Design a binder for this molecule. Structure first.
Ligand SMILES: CCCCCCCCCCCCOC(=O)c1ccc2[nH]cnc2c1
Lengths: 226, 230
């Protein structure tokens, strides 16, 4: 309740006001393979969500009560899933319009060189997500359920499960006020999309036009199970 | 050249004769669920990779001079070229007009049976097989070209001058033969398509390691890790 209110406040504070939106670089008709500028932009757009998602998670009630190690581990493990889910929800797949958490608005063709195919899969997911007409409260719970989840190497797993359970109840409680099971149905498809992001970074690291910035690199390495 | 004879012997010994082709697992049509794979598809993918390295190892030991390079230079050349060699040899021996992959053991598998294990990569390899086939490279030239892919400059060679020496020798053996029967610049034009296909193979292994239905065999894994510049 106060939980839901807290989760909603943290969500809306973590993104641009419809008025803080910037179309000054938006182009509805532009025209090759990726160059260094496309790869820089890809890393820059990813990097732009790092501090924002960190500050969002600190405002999730209970999140600061977890061990610093479990905090860092949860953030690293969900970063990509969180970037995708939040971009999918904020974006306008009907116009092929990507809206980033800084307020930057770009057409798919303007990011497509950097992201590759993954951008199309993300837009497919955005359309699927948009179709379920998820309200902000539900999404504020969903996004937190993506963060506060079991990962390998948690010190206090029981406490993470506890807090997940609490957020899950706050969500069910709100939805009652199969629809739940279709919301929760989008967490595994989000993990599959996470995989494509790891594939793309792998590929970009191979190609090495521009190296990933240290923090993305660490997320990449620390999130490989092998 | 006695070298060319040696190079041809090693090439022809390193694959099936048109008689020892094995259709015991071939199915002209299977109905796969695409974009996914089971443990059986992934084990076979690794087994086909594994089997090609063992055959390519034995082929390279038959290249005159190759056995007298340092053990370290031998391993480094084999690792560095393995994927290019697997692709080039598979492209050359395969029948893309019948959608037929032919492996160095003699095993024949339809495009659709390889789709689950290999993904897209198998289709790009068939595109390359067609491109390669259309250049009408004879066995002697290909026996030299495959060796030139192996015996080449790489970072971390202990005796690079000796590798260049042996490269030079195999290069002359090739020129001498192309003049004898009488496309080279045209062959070199398809070297980026091959480099891309090497990238696609690293992408596929990456993905399969992520997925981890079955672990990669140690030797393929070491080639994967040692072959990533980072
Ligand atoms: C159909 C495209 C290529 C088929 C084989 C012809 C090329 C022979 C080997 C490459 C050129 C001579 O050797 C090299 O300098 C060399 C060797 C291995 C390489 N791997 C990637 N680039 C390479 C270049």
């Amino acid at each position: 309740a106060n939980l839901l209110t807290s989760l909603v406040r943290a969500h809306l504070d973590s993104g641009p006001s419809t008025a803080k939106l910037d179309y000054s670089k938006f182009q509805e008709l532009v025209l090759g393979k990726e160059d260094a500028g496309d790869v820089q932009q890809f890393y820059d757009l990813l990097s732009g969500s790092l501090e924002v998602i960190r500050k969002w998670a600190e405002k999730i009630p209970g999140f600061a009560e977890l061990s610093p190690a479990d905090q860092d581990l949860l953030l690293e493990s969900a970063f990509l899933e969180l970037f995708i889910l939040r971009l999918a929800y904020r974006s306008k797949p009907g116009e092929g319009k990507l809206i980033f958490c800084s307020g930057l608005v770009l057409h798919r063709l303007q990011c497509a060189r950097g992201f590759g195919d993954w951008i199309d899969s993300i837009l497919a997911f955005s359309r699927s997500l948009h179709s379920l007409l998820v309200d902000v409260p539900a999404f504020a719970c969903l996004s937190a359920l993506v963060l506060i989840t079991d990962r390998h190497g948690l010190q206090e797993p029981r406490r993470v499960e506890e807090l997940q359970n609490r957020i899950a109840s706050c969500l069910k409680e709100h939805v009652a006020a199969s629809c739940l099971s279709r919301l929760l149905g989008k967490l595994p498809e989000l993990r599959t999309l996470c995989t494509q992001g790891l594939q793309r970074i792998f590929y970009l690291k191979l190609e090495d036009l521009v190296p990933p910035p240290p923090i993305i690199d660490k997320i990449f390495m620390d999130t490989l199970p092998f």
